[PDB]
Design a protein around this ligand. Sequence first.
Ligand SMILES: CC(=O)Nc1cc2c(cc1C)OCO2
Length: 185
Amino acid sequence: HHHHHHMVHITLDRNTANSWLIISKDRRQVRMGDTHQNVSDNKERFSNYPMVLGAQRFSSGKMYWEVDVTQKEAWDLGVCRDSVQRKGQFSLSPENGFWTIWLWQDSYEAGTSPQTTLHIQVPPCQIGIFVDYEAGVVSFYNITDHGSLIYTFSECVFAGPLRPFFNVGFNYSGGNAAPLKLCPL
Ligand SMILES: CC(=O)Nc1cc2c(cc1C)OCO2
């Protein structure tokens, strides 16, 4: 791919974070804490899952960023509508305003309804995410494997401004403590 030149500097929005997340000073890394992180509740925070949004909102153009997933056992990545549900239980699907992929139990899947099996020969340590707003495209790239395509959502109906979307996952196993990190341009 030749999407690198639409690179955008993403930062995480503390106010949207689940109350157990720890966001670094530079707003470029996030991990699961072992307890509540001593913040007040607000209507933006994801209540049920270890999720956080990027601060940036996109309503036009082409955007590209990269995320480090080294040593994680579980995570979700992609984009979502600014108006997605924050409270209670929900699935990740385009009908609910999400365009995502994930790792779970040693398998990679795209967040379609129902979910789609991904075919990845080289487990990724860094994921590239490309959004073309006007074309209605969200694509995922395996940076560890020379940028190979992972998945393309096409005919997307965004229906609003988009935000970068992250889920660090639970750490029930003791093997999923590692952070998600936004990689340098
Ligand atoms: C209905 C359902 O299983 N939802 C869900 C469960 C999760 C999660 C994210 C989502 C969307 O992060 C870890 O546990």
